Design a protein around this ligand. Structure first.
Ligand SMILES: OC[C@H]1O[C@H](O)[C@H](O)[C@@H](O)[C@H]1O
Length: 388
């Protein structure tokens, strides 16, 4: 269907539809381990079904044409294979340029032009990783048309590199890895420090993963994020004077706790603390998950939420409203914000049968409180990016 839609939307915009190829790159959620990725910690994310889809083909020439069903008002975008280096304001093609730029930089050669049509179910500021989906979409597309044999990991590090180096957004490999390594009904246990990971099948029993979007209108600016990154780095530096660690992730909670003096600043102390605690927490939480102790698991979820609420300070009235109200509900294991923070989505582990009611009970409070409405969706675990 959708394709048919896309498909027919391609000849229009682009004329024909010959030798065209279909791709898809999902979005993701992090079950646990937030703001650890860039602090040498573990993460427990999963790819969802909502993602980004692309129809594209090779060109005759070295020109690049792009259409985005989500922003039709730009009409078509083009550039030739030689402006990849110069961004264009905050346009979407930027992600396409960067990837090309990164791709080439790794020795890969994108010698021709091509066409690209995309549609993405991932909400602009959902916190569900729209950038990474796209980067990865491009990744696999380029990887396919130009028949490169880009290893997933590189592909992934390249997408992170674009975000970071080109787009200019600070981050860890969190989104790229999940999206890149996604597997149907599987979550990824990843050690960010070593890039060693484990695929974990999602085994929730009668529980569903309910995604709650604050729908909070906010400035897609990203400084608070950038400060965090800043902050912990500093803390880490201070720690490094007397400590032989490459990241905050190396520290036991006790070890951290004993050395807070190295830091001194109260706020710095909180951030890094959140960085330490969170990492260890993930470790244990994932085992719980693995052990089928959904309960302990859910309690840990709640715990991640408060650390983020209190020590790292990235939640907010909205995020807190959702999670906490959600926790209050019956047939709810625990709940927390997922992703960056500062709005976006939260998730909950809720009894399949209590879901419909949960949405209502929880939304109500929210609207009341936040004044506005939240959005509910049940997560659906799918595969990472691919040529399908
Ligand atoms: O866990 C917090 C999370 O926030 C954003 O989504 C970043 O892009 C991820 O790399 C990660 O740092």
């Amino acid at each position: 269907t959708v394709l048919s839609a896309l498909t027919e939307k391609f000849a229009e915009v682009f004329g024909d539809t010959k030798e065209v190829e279909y791709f898809f790159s999902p979005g993701r959620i992090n079950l646990i381990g937030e703001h650890t990725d860039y602090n040498g910690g573990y993460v427990f994310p999963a790819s969802i079904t909502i993602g980004t889809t692309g129809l594209a083909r090779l060109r005759e020439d070295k020109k690049v044409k792009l259409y985005s069903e989500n922003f039709p008002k730009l009409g078509v975008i083009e550039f030739d294979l030689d402006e990849v280096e110069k961004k264009d304001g905050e346009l979407w093609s930027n992600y396409v340029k960067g990837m090309i730029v990164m791709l080439k930089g790794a020795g890969y050669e994108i010698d021709k032009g091509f066409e690209l049509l995309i549609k993405g179910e991932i909400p602009t500021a959902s916190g569900l990783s729209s950038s990474a989906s796209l980067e990865l979409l491009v990744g696999v597309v380029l990887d396919d048309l130009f028949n490169l044999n880009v290893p997933r990991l590189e592909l992934v590090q390249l997408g992170q590199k674009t975000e970071n180096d080109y787009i200019g957004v600070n981050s860890g490999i969190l989104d790229q890895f999940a999206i890149g390594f996604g597997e149907v009904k599987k979550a990824i246990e990843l050690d960010c420090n070593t890039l060693k990971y484990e695929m974990v099948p999602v085994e929730l029993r009668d529980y569903d993963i309910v995604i709650m979007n604050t729908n909070k209108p906010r400035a897609l600016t990203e400084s608070k994020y950038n400060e965090r990154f800043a902050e912990t780095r500093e803390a880490l530096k201070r720690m490094q004077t007397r400590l032989d660690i490459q990241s905050l992730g190396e520290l036991s909670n006790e070890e951290f706790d004993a050395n807070t003096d190295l830091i001194g600043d109260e706020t710095l102390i909180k951030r890094a603390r959140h960085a330490v605690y969170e990492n260890n927490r993930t470790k244990i939480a994932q085992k719980a998950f693995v052990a089928g102790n959904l309960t302990k698991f859910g309690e840990l979820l709640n715990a991640s939420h408060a650390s983020l609420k209190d020590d790292y300070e990235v939640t907010g009235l909205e995020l807190d409203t959702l999670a906490e109200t959600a926790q209050k509900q019956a047939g709810v294991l625990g709940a927390r914000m997922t992703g960056a923070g500062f709005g976006g989505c939260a998730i909950a582990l809720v009894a399949h049968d209590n879901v419909s009611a949960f949405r209502k009970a929880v939304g109500q409070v929210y609207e009341e409180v936040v004044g506005y409405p939240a959005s509910f969706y049940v997560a659906q675990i799918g595969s990472g990016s691919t040529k399908l």
